[PDB]
Amino acid sequence: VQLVESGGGSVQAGGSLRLSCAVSGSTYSPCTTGWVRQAPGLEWVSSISSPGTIYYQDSVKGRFTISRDNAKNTVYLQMNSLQREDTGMYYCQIQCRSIREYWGQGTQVTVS
């Protein structure tokens, strides 16, 4: 069970960024995959449960978009109009009727 977070980095305010949470070795059923970001604390940003149901933190609805490519077992997070408020380490979490909870290494996202 391994997750590859990528697509982090620094950008100028108003800029855009797409992150990627690739999963390998999922020993179980369709997983729910979300994104928690730790800002200088922790907050649930968005998730997509597997059945296809999507949810978003209100502070990002309209600006962020979570999608998934089952064929690739990868989930993407498109973040548009990044404000200073969006700065933080972004981790993606996965859970598979299993209550298993796994995390990525996180990927830093800095906005000026």
- Piece in contact with its own copies (CB under 8 A), picked from 18-26, 40-48, 58-66, 73-81: 40-48
**Planar angle of CA 31, 33, 39, nearest 5 degrees:** 155
**Interface with its own copies includes 56 (CB under 8 A)?**
no
CB 59 within 8 A of CB 101: no
**Interface with its own copies includes 69 (CB under 8 A)?**
no
**Interface with its own copies includes 32 (CB under 8 A)?**
yes
Tell me the pairing of strands 9-11 and 107-111. parallel
**Interface with its own copies includes 41 (CB under 8 A)?**
yes
**Interface with its own copies includes 78 (CB under 8 A)?**
no
- Out of 43, 59, 67, 108, the only residue in the binding site for its own copies (CB under 8 A) is 43
In b/e form, how buried is each residue of 25-63, taking b as 16+ CB within 10 angstroms?
ebeeeebbbbbbbeeeeeeebbbbebeeeeebeeebeee
Which residues are near its own copies by CB under 8 A?
A: 32, 34, 36, 41-44, 47, 49, 53, 55, 91, 93, 98-103, 105-106
